[PDB]
Design a protein around this nucleic acid. Sequence first.
RNA 1: GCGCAAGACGGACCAGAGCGAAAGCAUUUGCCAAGAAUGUUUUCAUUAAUCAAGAACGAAAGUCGGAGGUUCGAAGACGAUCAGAUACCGUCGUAGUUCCGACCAUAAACGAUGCCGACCGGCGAUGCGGCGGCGUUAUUCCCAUGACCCGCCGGGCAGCUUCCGGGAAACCAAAGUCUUUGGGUUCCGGGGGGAGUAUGGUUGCAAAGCUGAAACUUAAAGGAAUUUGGCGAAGGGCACCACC
Lengths: 213, 101, 136, 67, 25
Amino acid sequence: VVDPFSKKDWYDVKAPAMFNIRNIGKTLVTRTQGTKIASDGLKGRVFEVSLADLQNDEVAFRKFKLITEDVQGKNCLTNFHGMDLTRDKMCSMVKKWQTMIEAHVDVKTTDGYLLRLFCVGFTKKRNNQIRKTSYAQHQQVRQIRKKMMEIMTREVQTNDLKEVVNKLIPDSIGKDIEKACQSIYPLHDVFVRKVKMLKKPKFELGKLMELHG
Amino acid sequence: TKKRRNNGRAKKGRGHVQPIRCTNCARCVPKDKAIKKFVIRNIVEAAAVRDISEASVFDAYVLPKLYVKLHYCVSCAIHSKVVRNRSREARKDRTPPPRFR
Amino acid sequence: SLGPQVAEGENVFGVCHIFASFNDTFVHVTDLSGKETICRVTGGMKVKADRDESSPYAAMLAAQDVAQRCKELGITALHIKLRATGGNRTKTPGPGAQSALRALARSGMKIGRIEDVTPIPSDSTRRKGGRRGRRL
Amino acid sequence: TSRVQPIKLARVTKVLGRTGSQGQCTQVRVEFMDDTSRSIIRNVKGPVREGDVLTLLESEREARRLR
Amino acid sequence: MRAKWRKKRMRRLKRKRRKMRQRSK
RNA sequence: GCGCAAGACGGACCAGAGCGAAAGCAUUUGCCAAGAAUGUUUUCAUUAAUCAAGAACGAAAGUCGGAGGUUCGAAGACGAUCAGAUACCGUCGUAGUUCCGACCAUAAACGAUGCCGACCGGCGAUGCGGCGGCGUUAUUCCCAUGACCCGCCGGGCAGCUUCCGGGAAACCAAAGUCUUUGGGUUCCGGGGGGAGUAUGGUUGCAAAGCUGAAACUUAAAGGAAUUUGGCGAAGGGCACCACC
């Protein structure tokens, strides 16, 4: 019988260089003992941090996943892992008497980062509209989904992770989708709701220090 | 005798609809027959919102809401005081109870 | 178990997963990553009668004990992660979530962002029970 | 327990309806003197009015209904 | 008695009489 | 909290909305075949409607032979409940639930309402196609296409009102155009039980499906609606022969 919290060390986590707020929080791990080391125990840790706590003045319904991969002594260096929207915003966007459109791709960046993107589009009621439903036909939905798919494809194959994360901080893809789909059926709530990561290449330190300065 | 113009549901030219499950119960009820109730609520009530706001890091922070859809079977809905019986001449009223508060 | 950091300028964050079913409540505190934990007392730990394990009283006492342990170790700011029993059973949180959250806020900590993380299935398997339901 | 809770003296402001199975108790809207901003609802048993001070052994409980 | 269980008992009587008839050949 | 594997399903969007002869059908993309309606100053010219024999499809459960078995879960094993509980409730759990190949042809398969054709009031919406017209938008000009707005036409799921009319009434714009009884055509019922029972034929591996009586017995069995009464039905009030 002994206190197990007397053998812990408080580490720090740092965001990569494309984020404004460098310091996120503090995580802790047990001390090094024999075969197991505190460097390995901080390896597979994913942090669910909001965009408002990682940037200065932006939207509060956006979150980013950051995973550590190396440590240099009381500082855990993180990298982009994923993107998701907050549950309350996604539930409040979905309402009755409108139809919603889903598209997804498996687009790859110019390096070995395989990404999976998700987005969403809800139909817009006009200002002078008397009708209640305002639905969309199936061919218009297919054309809008193909437009979304090609807009997803065109912004990623000519970029690597840094400026596409810089593009993912605002909804510039969402504004481009909403602007391009106006001739088909006008949308009003378009947000990139989920970004995953399928494949990851070999670990290179030089890109990590270029992604932190 | 026949009680309603419809058959207690919203099926007119279909013949078959997908079934759903009750939330207070586990009965397999058809989707257009079950009494549905989309309820929206805050995480905190009106008493604890001041206690949450005084112990918050962010000033002028918007409290999130909770979104849930409820599917009720007929006996479960009438036993939970969601819908009750009414008069023969008042059974044809389609409008909901008023949203005064 | 000491730390030479600043306390007046900023605060140390953690997250708290509040899992509340209709028969038991959980007040579980981890770090930011969630792999390493700090403390946990369940609603059946405080009351010695297993009838009202999901009572507001037991959730209040469990949240007060968790907040006392967190102030003892040195966690001041906390992010709320609210979860019901999820699945295909129900999605409404149990009757100890609001009481536990109010007791955790009234104990003298700082509350960040409240999040609902209950598992929402996309047409999962069959719900337990017959076609006629549980008749009682 | 390991908690010596300080007692709170609180003053009622209004009288709500009478709850309970046989109507033995009633609900009041009660407020404190040490902090005259916090107001809670309590179930009180006995003859009450508007102006009497109640001795609350705890101040972190919200009033349950009849059941 | 409802018609369902009277039909079930009738079918059981059909099975018993059919078995007795086919075994009394 | 991070990952791996297996099978099932397609929430929210999802509506008195759509399609299909019915059963039925909801992730994205691609391939193949089919169909209703709208438009037509195109073509054939009576090729049409209903249907014994015959023929295709046909919920779930059930059978035979394989692969697979996540969840749920007949039979079964227990724990409570109860006078009893081989029931309601809770923990496990076999066939089954899933796919392929071969069987049966059964549902409150219900709009409890056959198909084709004609006529007889009004109104507001809705899905499709076509037509016309002030205006707004895809940033400021023009044309066409999408998206709104105001109307017309045809087909379809439906709604409100009605001293049209009908009916025993509930109700029905059809269940109307019915003693002022006849547009054409297929199936089917003559009081309640026995009874979908006996026997014969027929289909099926089986479970069973179709056809289908008689003796005997009975003065009622039923449909709609009104009044009372009693609900371990709901909504308001009251009583120290009720309670706190």
